[model samples]
Target: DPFTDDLEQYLDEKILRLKDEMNIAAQLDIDTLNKRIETGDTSLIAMQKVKLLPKVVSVLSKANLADTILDNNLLQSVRIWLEPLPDGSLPSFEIQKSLFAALNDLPVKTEHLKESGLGRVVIFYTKSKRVEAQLARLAEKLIAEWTRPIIG
Candidate 1:
């Protein structure tokens, strides 16, 4: 539990630092791009700046820092990393069935049923995998359960 507590603290600090750095870089890039656009400049410099904007923003927006944090050894010790779930223990078919059942029970508001179903499947699988891994770890007595609820 103490190890988990320490790891959680470390991850929280790391994520905050990452968010600050990304935000600063994004804001600086946006300002530069805006200035270039306002000056009616379409030179190679401006074009290159525009091209870089999307890449930087995309990294900042979708770089999966949570996964990165998990990859780092320090953070990996906090939670059961989902990489070692036994094939049958994962209950993939059961989860899929549950997801489809939920979908059938719910009113479909959007026309993109396929897209929505895929999204739901992804979320369900990710959460299911994580929970299963955690249970396995707990069962193996690898990590102690903290009696106190986690507080932010």
Candidate 2:
């Protein structure tokens, strides 16, 4: 039998390490994404990060680190991910759905909205004719939810 004298200490250290690892992973993806967007690369490999980011965001949410989305400017990268490609098409429907699911779980506030620049991206989704009906509604609802506190 192995008894730990400082169980809480071990857990705390593990939590810190986990946060570091997740942040590093997310940053690397964001860096790649920014490069692709900046260089106007539309190759399939460059687009892989678009598909991967939503999953990374979901993982962070499940790990109770959703606030990192705001802290690390992850949502800004998400905006670029959803931007019109060179062909002037929305991202794949799968990407849209995955990202909406990933975004819905994160806690947001006026400050976070301002910091992350996600508010306008979501608003754009609400109006884009190419967006799926359900996803557009999701975007509309998110905007409503985000604005209520400010309006009141």
What are the models' TM-scores? 0.30, 0.64
The model with the greatest lDDT is 2
lDDT by residue for model 2 (1-152), tens: 13553754454454455445544544555555566667777552334545465555555456455644455555665655666554456767776777677777777777877875778889999998888899999888888888999684
In Å, residue 71's CA in model 2 sits off its true spot by 2.1
Per-residue lDDT value at 143 in model 1: 16
User: How do the residues 1-152 of candidate 1 rate in per-residue lDDT, one tens digit apiece?
Assistant: 99988977786677555445444543454455566667756551312222333333343344344343323321211111112222223323333233233333333222233322333333344445345554433333211121112321
In model 1, which runs have C-alpha deviations exceeding 4 angstroms? 41-152
In candidate 1, which residue pairs clash? none
